[PDB]
Paper text:
MjHKU4r-CoV-1 RBD is composed of a core structure and an external domain. Both DPP4 receptors bind to MjHKU4r-CoV-1 RBM via blades IV and V of their β propeller domains, in agreement with the complex structures of MERS-CoV RBD-hDPP4 and Ty-BatCoV-HKU4 RBD-hDPP4 solved previously.
The two MjHKU4r-CoV-1 RBD-MjDPP4 in the ASU are almost identical, with a RMSD of 0.335 Å over 936 aligned Cα atoms. Compared to the MjHKUr-CoV-1 RBD-hDPP4 complex, there are extra contacts between MjHKUr-CoV-1 RBD and MjDPP4, which involve residues M460, S511, Y525, A567 and L569 of viral RBD, and G296, D331, P333, S339 and R342 of MjDPP4. The RBD residue D471 only forms a salt bridge interaction with hDPP4 R336. Unexpectedly, although D471 is not in direct contact with residues in MjDPP4, D471A mutation showed a 10-fold reduction in affinity of MjHKU4r-CoV-1 RBD to MjDPP4, which is likely contributed by allosteric effects.
Numbering used by the authors:
A (entry chain C): 388 to 588
B (entry chain D): 40 to 767
C (entry chain B): 41 to 766
D (entry chain A): 390 to 590
């Protein structure tokens, strides 16, 4: 009935890439292009749909994954890209028409900059007798990392290590996670993942 | 002299000449002759002057050492040497130009420098001063501070803490240049929560109030220092901004608890090999880290990880062995234990976890000395099946079944114990023979494996020893319960098997130690055998190394057990051989050797009449963590606290009433603290046991000051001459 | 049967004593079989003041007791923990006599440092955490007096280390008024005083040893400052804070560093304070009167008294304490006469001169009791032997009339006396300690008659009849016109013809006396009875009780004369025909070890072996109050050259001729292990072999049972091996 | 009309640091000043009683300081104590009036931290520094120990020391201070001496 508002993406401190916040909207229609004018778009790749046909159409759902992402790491969020981002942080799903937007936030917008950037270098599980078996845990498209709970807001240094005992019900062993810290850029660079489903509302 | 006297050993009368060289290229080396640095050509032995001693004495100080840059354009001069601990020391430095033939007075190296080194190519300098790293791109230019967190006795940048210098690294340095000097790896050690040992230093007679030393020393079970490894790009520097260092995280299997950094090996300028070891030292991982140009980090992937562990004991001998990579950098050779338990060379691949052994047998490879694109050179104890011998071997990397010894038959009667120093590209190698004869230094060429010339034959010592009655050495073995255990006897001159001599058991018995060898020595045992006619015997029982995992790991989680009993059994075996007086049998040792001697004298076996313990261990809860925990684990009730308490010297105090005991220790000992010997004498007093004692004011582990070195051996001579009722 | 070493180290032949506490002019207390007994002095009839069943029912071993002057309460000391010579901490529970109950309301806290009753009543003043607390009634809250108490910095009511060991000879610094109106105390400030730091290894369970830290003033270092305060306890409002007025010392000692060496209450409105300069050549006694409308205590120049030494230091160690007549307008004091001998002088308060009442070629050891007609003092006048002590009494009206009260009770058995008088000096107990078995007798001051024998050691006598005990000769030898004394402990069946080995026991510190008439059962008794060794001691220059000309001969020259006289005595002992000139040794403790080391390092060839236990090596290493009293300050403007000349390390090369055994404890707080650590370092630097021994965590006495028996067993093997004795 | 403003302003001096106001020709008028103080003591002596209100206005000298009434007995004539020997001693050769008074609220009079007088002021001279000759003040003059701590003493019994130069006689000057607590009201003391002349007034 009403208008889908994007205000949570514009106020406060945005989350990290591994702790991204997800907004799904139903029973409303959107004005998608007014959000694009608020930011300086640096990329707009749309697999499944078109860079233009996304702002027009009534769907059964419209989802937006938003987080703080540095443009110096733009190559590690591309489709099929290997590296730490797609393995222990965020991997874009392609089970629906989707777009990927990397944009820079001006100081005019009322979103604050976090302390720094952050991603996980390692997210492995040490198991086996004598704790000799180490299996890295890779994320599934659209899901969250299992090392997410270690440092939600951010890391304190580069190469910060977190350990935790996995319960008997959680399979077994020790979950190890190493964080990575990048210096905060001049203007807040963001990342937006928009997706769409159908069913005629 | 007629016999080898104590004066001949304390003062140095019969001196052994050495030939120490520094390979400066693939075919030339430096050598010091009458304070003249000389440059030699390896092929034809022709030489030329590199630096004259007229230059050495234009200074107002005594030069202690020198270090020529790998470009031949600069010489580093070391002076104001001040010793601290085993390997560490502080000194001043002056950079000397060779093309200009002048000293550099513009932007100097500060006093009290802790470490300093050149880049492997060129003339770049990185040094540690006040626990911080400074890099000099050019000697005449000002240095650039790399680290800013260095604090005294808390945080070490580029240098080791006490336990890392002594037990894991065997060096004070933690700086590693890249093969071309673009990257500079270093370790940071944090001793904030590490406890502090506090002993007293009394110094010169002028000092009214003595001084209290404070050394961050992690005793058994205490908090260990944490370690991080950073890599800095030296070619992306800027004198306007601060330098950025990137940390290389260890593999996840070692981050589950406490761990150590035991080795750092550069493969190439973008691939670095790191070896991490857990606190419970039976799980190590050689992590191969590859640089990433886009982000600037170093990636440690699990796919290029290789696990080296041990189910029967600890990894390696004193630590995991270092890797030896090939030219392409996609494979390496290192010495690990085979399925039978003997240390042999295995062929690893960077991306495949399994390795292929290239050597096998009832012998061990001591160390890999050279690796070319076609041949691998290694030192082993294979020749004549003697664990106490060492010879150079060459194996073909394409037909491993083609192995040739390079030093076995050169002089079989004079030389059975070899080291080697290869030139760059392994084109020439210097053979250093230690025994059983007089030391012999020769130079060889790798092309045809032919000897070029004799560098040092010790001809002056051979003529000096002709008019002296030297003692002989008997190196043999016995079989105890179907096990070969080797011994060594220094027999007096004109030794008669019918006569009964007094026996002195020389013991160290530490893990992987070896007291029976084919090595020439002019020591105190030489004086006791030549003059006082005392058979000195050493025995390598359980726990001794270079013989397999079975013998080495026989004392695992139980120190003070089998090695003590085997020293008692060796004296009985030596007694019933015929030429030993059963009534006069003694035993002495140093550090671990003094610990075993105190345990032997506390067994009450009645075999030994007297014994001397010099700086001995008394309770393994008093020694440092890395050494003690490697063999005995943690002193908690959930591990091996009970074996920590059954292996104390204080617990055997009542048995010392049957022997005569001499306890010696230095008041400023930092390795085995005087607290160890303090608790020993405190136990024997609570038991009504009399003994002799001697402290040495402000002396360290080795009583190595000239005045104290002569005093400790003159005191021990009188103690043995009384215990054996010998004429004074 | 001879006196073996086991009999001395396992205490086989035990000497008996009779320790009493006078609670009145005619009554005393006696602890007999864990029963506190009250005795009537006139007739000797006893009473059960407290029984067996009273103690040992509290749940802890009782160490000591303190009956209140009114006989209503007793303190009970337990949880005793030793600290240095005189200091210690303990717990205290009060016991009511009337109700027969243990007071549980407002108990004395744990780790209390000092506690004492008032001279009358049942008022308590204790020091806890370096702060003074006043407990008026045992069941009421204590009242905190000081708030500046801090460990190893500020000491309130207690002393620091150098005051306890050398100045006060006691941990206490609290002085109640005659009937408890005031409480005078001292305050010490060790903020700028440097700290001696040594290691303590504790039990085997301790992984990292402990570093002990004690504020120690070495020679020339900063000394603690002293401030004396007086507080009115009878004006103590429980809702207000306590007010402490300070007594300012006279200006003659305020010109530099000064000490407080005596606090004696004259009456309730008059106090006596003795001050001493850092250079202990000048003293002052200040008689301070109270000012009721003002509230202060003032030292006026007319009631001040100056006593100084032109040849050395004031007093034998400190100036002697005064003894005031019952009116408070005069006092008697032991000072030095014109010829150097210390005698009793009669002082007036506002008169500077004093009149000697005792005179002779002898010395007064101490004033014991002062009545209206008699003064009782211990002296060494009898038989001209300085090694004797006898009780004397002198009429204050006719000084000519002087009576010895102990000279001829048992002249053969009793020649060394100490006395303990009752209140008002009605009855006195005589404590003889030699040369015979100790005899304790009770007397009466009226007729001066012996009432009864309290202890005669009849059991020790019978036990010593079937053992070949040694004898003891006490004679003298005149040398350069001066008479010096010595003593020999001759082995049993002493043959003057045969040559015996000689061991010279030595201390030789200032004002010491190793030649006395005291019965002892020690190590020298075993060496003479079992090993047939002659043990001898000599009191040469520096020894006291013989005059200032003999005591002050080593002034500013320590390590001289006192060391040579021990060497010359060994030569003259050889001149007696029964000494083997090839078996002569010397041994000592503390200062004895210093002289022994200087003797062995002299290279005289007279001594073969020697033993030094916990010895002083360099006088700059020892504490200030003791060292500077005899050597001054270690500055080139004072006596720095003789500080450097009199070091043991300077003579390390001469030790190549002697067998030297060096013993020291690792936790010695007096003569630090540093002193012996520099000796051994010089012997090693000089290329000298010797024997050594350290005792872990042992103090200056090495007095732990296992440790005490270990050092004498070790010294026995060394002396016997040196003397070829099996 | 010679206003006594200095005696009414600022923090008053301690007794040993007493200040003097001498007037020669200027005409004076009392009672004005007396009306500013509650006379707890007006013991006049010398020659003139309350007739000092008149005279010929010639050489009117007045000393003023801070003096507690608890020490009032030591300011009287011939009174023994540490005030007459080391602080203040009234001169009874010329007409004089001794006035002690408490001060009313904020009478532009500051409050000293506390009261202070010297309990000792002596010279330690002679060979070996054995003779202690106490130095007593003269009537009207100051003390030699005044130079030490004119502001006050930080502690009761504060010791001071100085070497008396060769021109100062030799030896050591020792002065010990005494500190009295601050009364709730500012207590003062005034000495008013007048002289005559052979010429005029
Ligand atoms: C050295 O180690 C100490 C910890 O042992 C680190 O100090 C910590 O610093 C953080 C951040 O300020 C604090 O939250 C902790 O409380 C500190 N711990 C302690 C014990 O003080 C210090 O950062 C380390 N230094 C380096 C360079 O790693
Ligand atoms: C390394 O040594 C430890 C001993 O400290 C081994 O831990 C033991 O593991 C077995 C399981 O196989 C347990 O039954 C024991 O109780 C453990 N011992 C202790 C003291 O906890 C560990 O297995 C060894 N690791 C390897 C790879 O050999
Ligand atoms: C010695 O005898 C006298 C009597 O001649 C005792 O005096 C009485 O002692 C008893 C027991 O202590 C008290 O109960 C009486 O109160 C005392 N008599 C008077 C009149 O007071 C004296 O106490 C005895 N001394 C003892 C028993 O030690
Ligand atoms: C003990 O003495 C110290 C000096 O050693 C006193 O401390 C000084 O106090 C004054 C005034 O409060 C300060 O100006 C100094 O800076 C202090 N010095 C030091 C080193 O602390 C201390 O007040 C004295 N304590 C007592 C109770 O008298
Ligand atoms: C105080 O002791 C010193 C000795 O320490 C004596 O002072 C000496 O006095 C004479 C005077 O004739 C000076 O020549 C000396 O230089 C002084 N000695 C020093 C070390 O300075 C003095 O005799 C003693 N005082 C008294 C009162 O006896
Ligand atoms: C210097 O070198 C020359 C060249 O052999 C040599 O003869 C001379 O003894 C040397 N002198 C010193 C002091 O090294
Ligand atoms: C080292 O110290 C000495 C004096 O201690 C000084 O003369 C010298 O200049 C110092 N070194 C440097 C490089 O400044
Ligand atoms: C007092 O008690 C002890 C034991 O504590 C006992 O042996 C003794 O006999 C008792 N005293 C008397 C006089 O009975």
């Amino acid at each position: 009935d009403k208008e889908c508002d994007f205000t949570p993406m514009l106020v406060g401190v945005p989350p990290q890439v591994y702790n991204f916040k997800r907004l799904v909207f139903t029973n409303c229609n959107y004005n998608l292009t007014k959000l694009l004018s608020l930011f300086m778009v640096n990329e707009f790749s749309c697999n499944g749909i078109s860079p233009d046909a996304i702002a027009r159409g009534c769907y059964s759902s419209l989802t937006v994954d938003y987080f703080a992402y540095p443009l110096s790491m733009r190559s590690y969020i591309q489709p099929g890209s290997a590296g730490d981002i797609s393995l222990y942080n965020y991997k874009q799903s392609f089970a629906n028409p989707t777009c990927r937007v990397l944009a820079t936030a001006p100081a005019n917008l009322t979103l604050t900059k976090p302390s720094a950037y952050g991603y996980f270098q390692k997210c492995s599980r040490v198991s086996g007798e004598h704790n000799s078996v180490e299996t890295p845990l890779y994320i599934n498209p659209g899901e969250y990392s299992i090392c997410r709970s270690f440092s939600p807001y951010g890391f304190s240094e580069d190469g910060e290590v977190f350990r935790r005992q996995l319960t008997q019900y959680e399979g077994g062993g020790i979950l190890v996670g190493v964080g990575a810290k990048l210096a905060m850029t001049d203007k807040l660079e963001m990342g937006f993942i928009i997706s769409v489903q159908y069913g005629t509302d | 002299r007629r016999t080898y006297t104590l004066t001949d050993y304390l003062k140095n009368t019969f001196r052994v000449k050495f030939y120490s060289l520094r390979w400066v290229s693939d075919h030339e080396y430096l050598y010091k002759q009458e304070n003249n640095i000389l440059l030699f050509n390896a092929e034809y032995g022709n030489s030329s002057i590199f630096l004259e001693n007229s230059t050495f004495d234009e200074f107002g100080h005594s030069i202690n050492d020198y270090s020529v840059s790998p470009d031949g354009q600069f010489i580093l001069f070391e002076y104001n040497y001040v010793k601290k601990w085993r390997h560490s020391y502080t000194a001043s430095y002056d950079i000397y130009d060779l093309h200009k033939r002048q000293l550099i007075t513009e932007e100097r190296i500060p006093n009290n420098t802790q470490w300093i080194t050149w880049s492997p190519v060129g003339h770049k300098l990185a040094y540690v001063w006040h626990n911080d790293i400074y890099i000099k791109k050019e000697p005449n230019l000002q240095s650039q501070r790399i680290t800013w967190t260095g604090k005294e006795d808390v945080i070490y940048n580029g240098i080791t803490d006490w336990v890392y210098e002594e037990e894991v690294f065997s060096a004070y340095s933690a700086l590693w240049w890249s093969p071309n000097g673009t990257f500079l790896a270093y370790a940071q050690f944090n001793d904030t929560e590490v406890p502090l040992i506090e002993y007293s230093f009394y110094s010169d007679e002028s000092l009214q109030y003595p001084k209290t030393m404070q050394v961050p020393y992690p005793k058994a079970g205490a908090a260990n220092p944490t370690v991080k490894l950073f890599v800095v790009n030296t070619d992306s520097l800027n004198s306007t901004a601060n330098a950025t260092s990137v940390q290389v995280v260890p593999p996840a299997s070692v981050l589950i608890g406490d761990h150590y950094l035991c080795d750092v090996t550069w493969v190439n300028e973008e691939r670095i090999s790191l070896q991490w070891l857990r606190r419970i030292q039976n799980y190590s991982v050689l992590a191969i880290c590859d640089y990433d140009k886009p982000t600037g980090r170093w990636a440690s992937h699990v796919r290029q990880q290789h696990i080296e562990s041990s189910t029967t004991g600890w990894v390696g001998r004193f630590k995991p062995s270092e890797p030896h990579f090939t030219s392409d950098g996609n494979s390496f050779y290192k010495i690990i234990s085979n399925k039978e338990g003997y240390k042999h060379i295995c062929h690893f691949q960077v991306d495949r976890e399994n390795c292929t052994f290239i050597t096998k047998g009832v012998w061990e490879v001591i160390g890999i000395e050279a690796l070319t694109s076609d041949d691998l050179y290694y030192i082993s104890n294979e020749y004549k099946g003697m664990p106490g011998g060492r010879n150079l071997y060459k194996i073909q990397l394409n037909d491993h079944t083609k192995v040739t010894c390079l030093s076995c038959e050169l002089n079989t009667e004079r030389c059975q114990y070899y080291s080697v120093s290869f030139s760059k590209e392994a084109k020439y190698y210097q053979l250093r023979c230690s025994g059983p004869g007089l030391p012999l230094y020769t130079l060889h060429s790798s092309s045809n494996d032919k000897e070029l010339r004799v560098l040092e034959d010790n001809s002056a010592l051979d003529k000096m020893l002709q008019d002296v009655q030297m003692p002989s050495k008997k190196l043999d073995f016995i079989i105890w319960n179907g096990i070969k255990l080797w011994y060594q006897m220094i027999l007096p001159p004109h030794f008669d098997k019918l006569k009964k001599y007094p026996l002195l058991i020389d013991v160290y018995a530490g893990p992987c130690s070896q007291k029976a060898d084919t090595v020439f020595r002019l020591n105190w045992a030489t004086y006791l055998a030549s003059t006082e006619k005392i058979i000195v015997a050493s025995f390598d029982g359980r726990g001794s190394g270079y013989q397999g995992d079975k013998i080495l790991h026989a004392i695992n989680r139980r120190l003070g057990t089998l090695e003590v009993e085997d020293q008692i059994e060796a004296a009985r075996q030596f007694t019933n051989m015929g030429f030993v007086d059963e009534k006069r049998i003694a035993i002495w040792g140093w550090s671990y050797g003094g610990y075993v001697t105190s345990m032997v004298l506390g067994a009450g076996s009645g075999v030994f009449k007297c014994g001397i313990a010099v700086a001995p261990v008394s309770r393994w809860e008093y020694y440092d963590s890395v050494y003690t925990e490697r063999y005995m684990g943690l002193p908690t009730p959930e591990d091996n606290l009970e074996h920590y308490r059954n292996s104390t010297v204080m617990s055997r105090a009542e048995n010392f009433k049957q022997v005569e005991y001499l306890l010696i220790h230095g008041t400023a000992d930092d390795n085995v603290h005087f607290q160890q010997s303090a608790q020993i004498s405190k136990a024997l007093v609570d038991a009504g046991v009399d003994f002799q004692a001697m402290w040495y004011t402000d002396e360290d582990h080795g009583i190595a000051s000239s005045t104290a070195h002569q005093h400790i051996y003159t005191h021990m001579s009188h103690f043995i001459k009384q215990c054996f009722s010998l004429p004074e």
